């Protein structure tokens, strides 16, 4: 329609605003707050910068090319605007590829979740990406190599009102493979091993870390006695001074009240051995425990850490079916109890662990695993927004004039919106959520 162009213009203007305002907040939160100045966040700034240049130099000039159906900026800016457009995509895919490699080397490292690259060394990697991007995008466009031999393409380059990206079969293969396909193959494969290592990390300590909760300070439990770390009872005495004398005796140093993650893991290993021996000494728990595998053994220990050996022995109907290796039948009995009524979220994970015999119930539940899931969506969003364009671009090489001009522009425009997608996905992390609130005054 006639007035439809005006209506679509307001929609496209809000997209430009969503990309700029969104990415500005990401770059500002990292630079202003010292809290978010990590090695990975330095690449996030580089990723947000590449998305910012899109919404300032590519997206506003790109939207105007549809509103008037022609170019009103000149042949000089037409070549420059196209050069930035490819540069921003080339840098983004390479930065996301670097993050995938960086996260793999941090997860496999003995000092887990800590990047091997230093602040000064990471800044070089950012510059290495932009220089390689400039050599692969700016050079083939400015120093003409993309120009097609056919007359239909020549008419567009000659015209001052035409800025359609007509490319030869040699460049169309090179620009798709080097600036998109090759970094995508590495990004998908390497980050798949990152999720594989997250599944490898799943242990008895990590299971109770989500269920009970690791607490470095001395706290009074549900009963009233002094507890520390993961369900480790210090003393039954109501005096706090008695707990401090036991805490120093259990570790071997002056604690004063606060301990560490590694020392809490050491105390848990002392408690887990006492729990297993407590089950073996028990007349009812011992025959059931012998008929449980390594993963399912941990689900029974999880119950003992919550209520105790006498409490778990009370589940007469549940234990009889667990010993017989009937998982689906015992799951109903375990759900029909006081344990499920008091702690529903905890029981749901434990019962599902008994059902399958896998740690799949504790997927993306840890503080570290949620951060890996967040970065995984950034890689997933860029793929699902750019791949439908790049997969269609190869069809033009196979069959000439098959895909419509409206189809080519729309699929290219899906990747334009992707620049403003990332800041909204960054809101998932609680560290960034506090940074955006204090900056915008909420
Ligand atoms: S102003 C002309 C009418 C509107 O249509 C457009 C024409 C041209 C563009 C910019 C071209 N898009 C580049 C594309 O995103 C891209 C990126 C990266 C790589 O490696 C590419 N390789 C290719 O072979 C082809 C395209 C590539 C935008 C328009 O829409 C506003
Ligand atoms: C403009 C074209 C040519 C490329 C621009 C690349 C720019 C945006 C890249 C390259 C170097 C990068 C910077 C490297 C160092 C830092 C300091 C750090 O504490 C926050 C991120 C920050 C600030 C990066 C921001 C993004 C950055 C400035």
From Swiss-Prot:
Designated name of the protein: Beta-2 adrenergic receptor
Molecular function GO labels: adenylate cyclase binding; amyloid-beta binding; beta2-adrenergic receptor activity; identical protein binding; norepinephrine binding; potassium channel regulator activity; protein homodimerization activity; protein-containing complex binding
Residue numbers of the full-length protein present here: 29 to 342 of 413
GO cellular component: apical plasma membrane; ciliary basal body; cilium; clathrin-coated endocytic vesicle membrane; early endosome; endosome; endosome membrane; Golgi apparatus
Function description: Beta-adrenergic receptors mediate the catecholamine-induced activation of adenylate cyclase through the action of G proteins. The beta-2-adrenergic receptor binds epinephrine with an approximately 30-fold greater affinity than it does norepinephrine.
Subcellular location: Cell membrane; Early endosome; Golgi apparatus
Consequence of changing residue 113 to F: Abolishes insulin-induced tyrosine phosphorylation and insulin-induced receptor supersensitization
Membrane topology classification: Multi-pass membrane protein
Protein source organism: Homo sapiens
Family in the record: Belongs to the G-protein coupled receptor 1 family. Adrenergic receptor subfamily. ADRB2 sub-subfamily.
Entry keywords, A to Z: Cell membrane, Disulfide bond, Endosome, G-protein coupled receptor, Glycoprotein, Golgi apparatus, Hydroxylation, Lipoprotein, Membrane, Palmitate, Phosphoprotein, Receptor, Transducer, Transmembrane, Transmembrane helix, Ubl conjugation
Disulfide bond sites: 78-163, 156-162
Signal peptide: none
PTM: Palmitoylated. Mainly palmitoylated at Cys-441. Palmitoylation may reduce accessibility of phosphorylation sites by anchoring the receptor to the plasma membrane. Also undergoes transient, ligand-induced palmitoylation at Cys-365 probably by ZDHHC9, ZDHHC14 and ZDHHC18 within the Golgi. Palmitoylation at Cys-365 requires phosphorylation by PKA and receptor internalization and stabilizes the receptor. Could be depalmitoylated by LYPLA1 at the plasma membrane.
Consequence when changing residue 365 to A: Loss of ligand-induced palmitoylation
Residues carrying Phosphotyrosine: 113
Organism ancestry: Eukaryota, Metazoa, Chordata, Craniata, Vertebrata
């Amino acid at each position: 329609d006639e007035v439809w162009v005006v209506g679509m213009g307001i929609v496209m203007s809000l997209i430009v605003l969503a990309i700029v305002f969104g990415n500005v907040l990401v770059i500002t939160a990292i630079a202003k707050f010292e809290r978010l100045q990590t090695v990975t966040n330095y690449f996030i700034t580089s990723l947000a910068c590449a998305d910012l240049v899109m919404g300032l130099a590519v997206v506003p000039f790109g939207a105007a090319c549809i509103l008037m159906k022609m170019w009103t900026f000149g042949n000089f800016w037409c070549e420059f605007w196209t050069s930035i457009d490819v540069l921003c995509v080339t840098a983004s895919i390479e930065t996301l590829c670097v993050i995938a490699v960086d996260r793999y080397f941090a997860i496999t490292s003995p000092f887990k979740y800590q990047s091997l690259l230093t602040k000064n060394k990471a800044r070089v990697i950012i510059l290495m990406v932009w220089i390689v991007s400039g050599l692969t995008s700016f050079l083939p466009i400015q120093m003409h190599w993309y120009r097609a031999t056919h007359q239909e393409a020549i008419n567009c380059y000659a015209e001052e009102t035409c800025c359609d990206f007509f490319t030869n079969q040699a460049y169309a293969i090179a620009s798709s493979i080097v600036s998109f396909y090759v970094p995508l193959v590495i990004m998908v494969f390497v980050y798949s091993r990152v999720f594989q290592e997250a599944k490898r990390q799943l242990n008895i300590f990590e299971m109770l870390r989500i269920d009970e909760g690791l607490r470095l300070k001395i706290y009074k439990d549900t009963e009233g006695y002094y507890t520390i770390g993961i369900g480790h009872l210090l003393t039954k005495s109501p005096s706090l001074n008695a707990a401090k004398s036991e805490l120093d005796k259990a570790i071997g140093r002056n604690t004063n009240g606060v301990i560490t993650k590694d020392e809490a893991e050491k105390l848990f290993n002392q408690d887990v051995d006492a729990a297993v021996r407590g089950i073996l000494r028990n007349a009812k728990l011992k025959p059931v425990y012998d008929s449980l595998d390594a993963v399912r053994r941990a689900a029974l220990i999880n119950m003992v850490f919550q209520m105790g050996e006498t409490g778990v022995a009370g589940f007469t109907n549940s234990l009889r079916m667990l010993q017989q290796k009937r998982w689906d039948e015992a799951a109903v009995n375990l759900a029909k109890s006081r344990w499920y009524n008091q702690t529903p979220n905890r029981a749901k994970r434990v019962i599902t662990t008994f059902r399958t015999g896998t740690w799949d119930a504790y997927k993306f539940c840890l503080k570290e695993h949620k951060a890996l899931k967040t970065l995984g969506i950034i890689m997933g969003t860029f793929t699902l927004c750019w791949l439908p364009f790049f997969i269609v671009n190869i069809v033009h090489v196979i069959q000439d004039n098959l895909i419509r001009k409206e189809v080519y522009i729309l699929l290219n425009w899906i990747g334009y919106v992707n620049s403003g997608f990332n800041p909204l996905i960054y809101c998932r992390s609680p560290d960034f959520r506090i940074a955006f609130q204090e900056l915008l005054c909420l």
